[PDB]
Amino acid sequence: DKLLLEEALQDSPQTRSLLSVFEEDAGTLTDYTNQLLQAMQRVYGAQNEMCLATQQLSKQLLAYEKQNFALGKGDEEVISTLHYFSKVVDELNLLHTELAKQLADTMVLPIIQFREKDLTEVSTLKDLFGLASNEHDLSMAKYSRLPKKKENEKVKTEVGKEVAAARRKQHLSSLQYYCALNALQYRKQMAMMEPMIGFAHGQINFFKKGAEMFSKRMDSFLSSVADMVQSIQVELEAEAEKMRVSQQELLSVDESVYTPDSDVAAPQINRNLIQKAGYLNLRNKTGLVTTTWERLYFFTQGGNLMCQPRGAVAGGLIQDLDNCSVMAVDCEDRRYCFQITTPNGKSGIILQAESRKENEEWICAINNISRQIY
Amino acid sequence: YFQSNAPAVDKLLLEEALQDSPQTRSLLSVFEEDAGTLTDYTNQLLQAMQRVYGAQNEMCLATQQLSKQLLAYEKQNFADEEVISTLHYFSKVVDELNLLHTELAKQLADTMVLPIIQFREKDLTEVSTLKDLFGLASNEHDLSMAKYSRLPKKKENEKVKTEVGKEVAAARRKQHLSSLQYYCALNALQYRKQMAMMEPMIGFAHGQINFFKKGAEMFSKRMDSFLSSVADMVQSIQVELEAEAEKMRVSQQELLSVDESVYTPDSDVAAPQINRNLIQKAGYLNLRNKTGLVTTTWERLYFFTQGGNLMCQPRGAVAGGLIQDLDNCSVMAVDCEDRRYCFQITTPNGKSGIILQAESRKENEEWICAINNISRQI
């Protein structure tokens, strides 16, 4: 399998039938190198992808302290760990980055140069040799059709020169094209080894710097974070049990407590207080003639009544303080509704309690809170 | 300045769930809002941790496929002895490496991606479940208080009144109950949050220690000193290339130093260097070929004499050709189609010979004389 260039001009057909074995193996080589090129760019891809994915974790771990909650801010210890685990991934990004750089120059770059320069140069010298050959082959046919009797010598001669110009062209392109294919035999052997040596090398660095960074000494901090997590689980667990019991006790209450009444005069009713607050319904002339009865929480402070609707904090613009008077009143045929009245007596507000117990207690608690006129 | 404080963790008191004061329900709203931004974040983060698992699980395939191609070199037909022996080695390194990335990917998913998924899909999901459920029972209770409020003061129906009171017992119970369950959940979540933020990342660090520790041994200085012998094995090719490369450039120069009289068949008939005494040719000639009773054609074809036989073999043929002879023939120049330098090898019958065509007359004569010299080989 020499493909010896020194023979020749005017190629034997046996020379050709070897040259075709070169052309053959070349073709199947270029095919395979594409199949291998892709595979190596796919590992490089995944390498670069690893760099971005880590790079994203840094951002997101740090983003915790940037997210704004209603509680759990300045988590300090939790912030500290997330910040540490971030600094880790940051340095891991550089190891996968350095490996990415490596695979792109010592592994992938070789194969591209081979495919783009070597295998390429061959496939082009081939084409030039092929064309060069055909040009000759045809000039030969022309030269053969020259007539024997009678010709002009000067014509015969010129056609011969044409044949020769072509023959030497074929010689030139064929010598080049052969040297090309022989050299390729050595180039491939290196082009298949070197790329994979580069791979192995870049990885030594990846596992060297890396295993150093992920030492047993780092492992001492990890174990202490785990103990912090363990100390939370115990808190949680006992706290869950505290709540589990607390819940059961509050749910063991009998049905009479969820039912509105109760019974008239059965539970005593403190007649002299100021403290009282709770839900009631408030009449509200929504439109002329129409009314709505909205449940809202009422409570008392500095001689004033307040209204805090459910949900929101604070609020409660209600008429007091002044000399008002409260008394039970009938309204829209409703039960346990009562009404206060401004000093004027105009636009008196009217509310409703559910219990009777509660009804009389509110009323007792408002005509006696307004006693303080001094 | 700032002075030390007695610590605190945030809780809904539970005892004030039956009461359901609006001031309790205000703290509940902030609790929800906290849970809100949290679910937003754990989503945002989970996405990120699934992408590193992505890049990992993909790397597992990327290596898996690489070796399969390193191992496909030995499956193509060729004319690479030590090349195969290394590609197997470098394959072992890749299949072995793959195993590590696979062992990582696995642990990555079980010890890091898992604790967040479960967190978002069981713990955070339970909150929303109990919230929608809680607010529902509260909505029910509100509409229940309505009916009770509409009941007439006179004339009161002692049967209707007792029926609606019982309706208020339930739904109020339902609210109280769902509220205790919803609160207890949110309180517990304050603790789950912390654990499920720092714990997920621990497992990932552990996988990455075992990954680098198991992989640092693997990629040792033994491998390093071996790679050196392969670098040497590559140099020993670069030198043999440069050697045979220089040799070829020289040979190429020499073969082209020839002057144009060689490339030309034009070379004068006058003064032809004819070797009339040989036993082997050697050349391309054109072969007259009948292509119908009238029409004919001439094809360039190699020709070589062998065991008394004239052979053919067209260019690009596997081999050939066995066209005429071995035994008795007579060859002579011929005038055929006004072509120049044709000659006919006649069969022993004394009729019907093949007609060939040479290029230079130097060639024609040499072919003729040669054939005749073969025709006397006894």
Residue B38 touches chain A, beta carbons under 8 Å: yes
Closest-CA residue of chain A to B94? A200
The CA distance from A1 to the nearest CA of chain B, in Å, is: 7
Pairwise CA distance, residues A153 & A297, whole Å: 128
Query: Could B316 and A20 be called an inter-chain contact, meaning their C-beta atoms sit closer than 8 Å?
Result: yes
Say how far apart CA A105 and CA A102 lie, in whole Å: 5
- C-alpha to C-alpha distances, B325 to A191, B310, B320, B376, nearest whole angstrom: 51, 6, 15, 12
Residue A188 to residue B80, Cβ atoms within 8 A: yes
Chain Cα centroid distance, residue A6: 64
Coil/strand/helix, residue B320: coil
Question: Nearest CA of chain A to the CA of B125: how many Å?
Answer: 18
Q: How many residues would you count in chain A? A: 374
For B265, which of A29, A163, A281 is closest by C-beta distance?
A163
Q: A325-328 and A305-306: which strand pairing?
A: unpaired
Give the gyration radius of chain A's Cα atoms. Answer: 49
Q: How is residue B74 annotated by DSSP?
A: G
Among B223, B237, B245, B243, CA closest to B82: B237
Other Cβ atoms within 10 Å of B66 Cβ, number: 25
Query: Which CATH fold would you assign to the domain B1-231?
Result: Substrate Binding Domain Of Dnak; Chain:A; Domain 2 (1.20.1270)
A3 Cβ neighbours under 8 A, 6+ residues apart: A18, A19, A22, A178, A181, A182
Q: How far is CA B189 from the centre of its chain?
A: 45
Contact A6, B251 (CB under 8 A): yes
- As beta bridge partners, residue B291 has none
Q: What single string gives the DSSP state of each residue in B230-241?
A: HHHHHHHHHHHH
Collect all residues with Cβ–Cβ distance below 8 Å to B177 and sequence separation of at least 6. Answer: A251, B137
In the structure encoding, which two tokens stand for residue A59, read together? 């951002």
Tell me whether residue A319 is exposed, middle or buried, using C-beta atoms within 10 angstroms of its C-beta: 0 to 12, 13 to 18, 19 or more.
middle
Please state, in angstroms and rounded to a whole number, the distance separating the CA atoms of residues B244 and A5.
12
B359 neighbors B345 (Cβ within 8 angstroms) = no
To the nearest 10 degrees (0 to 180), the angle between helices A194-213 and B221-256 is 160
CB contact (8 A) between residue B215 and residue A235:
no
Angle, CA of A357, A358 and A360, to the nearest 5°: 75
Closest CB from A32, A145, A313 relative to B26: A313
The DSSP call for residue B324 is B
Q: Which residues of B77-93 are buried (b: 16+ CB within 10 A; e: fewer)?
A: ebebeebeebbebbbeb
Alpha-carbon separation of residue B158 from A250, A260, A330, B165 (angstroms):
30, 14, 19, 11
Give the burial string for A23-45 (b: 16+ CB within 10 Å, else e).
bebbeebbebbeebbebbbbbbb
Q: Is B7 exposed, middle or buried (0-12, 13-18, 19+ CB in 10 A)?
A: exposed
Whether residue B148 contacts residue B168, with contact meaning beta carbons closer than 8 Å, is answered with yes
A352: β partners: A281, A337
Strands B282-290, A350-352: parallel, antiparallel or unpaired by DSSP?
unpaired
**With an 8 Å Cβ cutoff, are B79 and A281 in contact?**
no
Say if residues A336 and A325 touch (Cβ distance below 8 Å).
no
Sheet holding B342-346, edge to edge: B310-311, B296-305, B282-290, B354-357, B342-346, B330-334
| The 3-state secondary structure of chain A, one letter per residue | CCCCCCCCCCCCHHHHHHHHHHHHHHHHHHHHHHHHHHHHHHHHHHHHHHHHHHHHHHHHHHHHHHCCCCCCCCCCHHHHHHHHHHHHHHHHHHHHHHHHHHHHHHHHHHHHHHHHHHHHHHHHHHHHHHHHHHHHHHHHHHHHCCCCCCCCHHHHHHHHHHHHHHHHHHHHHHHHHHHHHHHHHHHHHHHCCHHHHHHHHHHHHHHHHHHHHCCCCHHHHHHHHHHHHHHHHHHHHHHHHHHHHHHHHHHCCCHHHCCCCCCCCCCCCCCCCCCCCEEEEEEECCCCCCCEEEEEEEEECCCCEECCCCCCCCCCCCCCCCCCEEEECCCCCCCCEEEEECCCCCCCCEEECCCCHHHHHHHHHHHCCCCCCC
B34 and A148 within 8 Å at the Cβ level: the answer is: no
Which residues on adjacent β-strands are paired with residue A306?
Answer: A299
A52 at the B interface (CB within 8 A)?
yes
Q: Which of B29, B166, B177 sits opposite A251 (nearest CB)?
A: B177
Breaks in chain B, after residue numbers (C to N greater than 2.5 Å): 79
CA distances from B71 to A123, B5, B14, B236, B329 (A): 25, 68, 68, 24, 58
CA B89 – CA B233 distance, rounded (Å)? 14
For residues A132 and A126, what is the distance between their CA atoms, to the nearest angstrom? 10
- Just give the CATH number of B277-378: 2.30.29.30
Determine whether B272 is exposed, middle or buried from the number of CB atoms within 10 Å of its CB (0-12, 13-18, 19+).
middle
User: Which two tokens mark B269?
Assistant: 């008939």
Separation of alpha carbons A338 and B314, rounded Å: 123
CA distance B190 to B35: 9
Cα torsion angle, A230, A234, A237, A239, sign? negative
* Beta-sheet strand order (sheet of A337-341): A305-306, A292-300, A278-284, A350-352, A337-341, A325-328
User: Does residue A141 sit at the B interface (CB-CB below 8 Å)?
Assistant: yes
Resolution attained, angstroms: 3.5
Contact criterion met (CB < 8 Å) for B165 and A71: no
Give the number of other Cβ atoms within 10 Å of residue A188's Cβ. 21
Residues 6+ apart with CB under 8 A from A255: B169, B173
Question: B287 in contact with A at a CB cutoff of 8 Å?
Answer: no
- Burial code (b: 16+ CB inside 10 Å, e: under 16) for B280-293 equals ebebbbbbbeeeee
Kindly determine whether residue A163 and residue B264, on different chains, have CB atoms separated by under 8 Å.
yes
Using alpha carbons, select from B355, B365, B367 the residue that is nearest to residue B323. Answer: B355
| CA A119/CA B343 separation, integer angstroms | 45
Query: Nearest 5°: CA angle at A95, between A89 and A98?
Result: 140
**Interface contact B13, partner A, CB < 8 A:** no
Spell out which residues of chain B touch residue A177, defining contact as CB-CB under 8 Å. Answer: none
Bond from prior residue into A80 cis (ω within 30 degrees of 0):
no
Chain A interface test: which of B50, B113, B191, B212 (most A C-beta within 10 Å): B212
Determine the distance in angstroms separating the CA of A373 from the nearest CA of chain B, rounded to an integer: 30
Q: Tokens 């210890």 identify what position? A: A77
Q: How is chain B split into domains, by residue range?
A: 1-231, 277-378
Q: What's the token pair of residue A251?
A: 């749910």
For B105, the token pair is 């990917």
> Would the CB atoms of B201 and A81 count as touching at under 8 Å?
yes
Place of tokens 């909205």: A294
Burial of A287 by CB count in 10 Å (0-12 exposed, 13-18 middle, 19+ buried)?
Answer: exposed
Chain A interface disruption, residue of B201, B285, B286, most A CBs within 10 A? B201
Q: How far apart are the CA of B71 and the nearest CA of chain A, in angstroms?
A: 10
DSSP B266: T
B70 chain-A contacts, CB cut-off 8 A: 36, 196
Distant-in-sequence, close-in-space partners of A266: CB < 8 Å, separation ≥ 6: none
Q: How far apart are CA B359 and CA B357, in angstroms?
A: 7
Which residues lie closer than 8 Å to B339 by C-beta, 6 or more apart?
A144, A145, A146, A147, A148, B298, B357
- Terminal CA-to-CA distance of chain B, rounded, Å? 128
Element (H, E) at B33: helix B22-70
Q: What is the DSSP letter of B262?
A: T
CA angle A111, A115, A116 (to 5 degrees): 115
Chain centre distance of CA A169? 62
Enter the tokens of residue B239: 């030198």
* Buried-state track A269-279, b at ≥16 Cβ within 10 A, e below 16: beeeeeebbeb
The Cα of A347 is separated from the nearest Cα of chain B by a number of Å equal to 22
Place of tokens 């509260």: B138
In this structure, are residues B34 and A72 in contact, taking their beta carbons and an 8 Å threshold? yes
Give, for B149, the enclosing helix (H) or strand (E). Answer: helix B124-150
Q: Quick count: other Cβ atoms within 10 Å of Cβ A138?
A: 12
Q: Quick check: bond before A27 cis, omega within 30?
A: no
Question: What CA dihedral angle connects B112, B114, B118 and B119, to 10 degrees?
Answer: 10
* Dihedral sign computed on CA atoms, order B101, B106, B111, B113: positive
- Which residues are CB-contacts of B122 (< 8 A; sequence separation ≥ 6)? none
Contacts of residue A315, defined as CB under 8 A and 6 or more positions apart, other chains included, come to A306, A307, A308, A309
Query: Two tokens at B372?
Result: 């005749």
Tell me if A303 sits within 8 A of A326, measured CB to CB.
Answer: no
Residues in chain A with CB shorter than 8 Å from the CB of B21 are: 297
Contact B178, B144 (CB under 8 A): no
Strand partners of residue B302: B284
Tokens of A342: 């401004």
**Cα dist from B265 to A135, A167, B68, B212, whole Å:** 16, 10, 56, 74
Chain B residues with CB under 8 Å of A232 CB are 191, 194-195
Under 8 Å between Cβ of A213 and A91: yes
Chain B closest-CA separation from residue A346 CA (Å): 25
Q: Measured between alpha carbons, how far is A8 from B211 in angstroms, rounded to an integer?
A: 60
Q: Do A260 and B191 touch (CB under 8 A)?
A: no
Residue B195: strand, helix, or coil:
helix
The answer, for B10 touching chain A at a CB cutoff of 8 Å, is yes
Q: How far apart are CA B194 and CA A183, in angstroms?
A: 66
Q: Token pair of B29, please? A: 């709203």
Cα B370 to chain centroid, rounded: 62
Beta bridge partners of A341: A325
- Dist. CA B211–CA A46, nearest whole Å: 17
- B283: which strand partners? B303
Please state, in angstroms and rounded to a whole number, the distance separating the CA atoms of residues A22 and A182. Answer: 9
Distance CA B183, CA B31 (A): 9
Please name the residues between 215 and 274 in chain A that touch chain B, using a CB distance below 8 Å.
218-219, 222, 225-226, 228-229, 232-233, 235-236, 239-240, 243-244, 246-247, 250-251, 253, 255, 258-261
CA nearest A73: which of B38, B312, B340, B3? B38
- A239 with B173: Cβ contact below 8 A: no
Type of residue found at A168? R
- Supply the CATH classification number for the domain A272-374: 2.30.29.30
Q: What letter represents residue B198's amino acid? A: M
C-beta atoms of A140 and B300 within 8 A: yes
**Residue B17 CB partners (closer than 8 Å, separation 6+):** A250, B24, B176, B179, B180, B183
Tokens describing residue A347? 């636009």
Q: Helix (H, G, I), strand (E, B), or coil: what is residue B333? A: strand
* Distance of residue A348 Cα from the nearest chain B Cα, in angstroms: 20
Q: What is the CA radius of gyration of chain B?
A: 49
Distance CA A15, CA B313 (A): 12
- What is the distance in angstroms between the Cα of B201 and the nearest Cα belonging to chain A? 7
Q: Is the dihedral of CA B171, B173, B179, B184 positive or negative?
A: negative
In the DSSP assignment, the letter for residue B153 is S
Superfamily for the A1-226 domain = Arfaptin homology (AH) domain/BAR domain (1.20.1270.60)
Strand segments (E) across chain B: 282-290, 296-305, 310-311, 330-334, 342-346, 354-357
Residue recorded with tokens 């039970």: A328
Cα–Cα distance for residue pair B279/B309, rounded to 1 Å: 11
Instruction: Decide if A354 and B148 are in contact by the 8 Å CB cutoff.
Output: yes
Q: What angle do CA B244, B246, B247 make, to 5 degrees?
A: 60
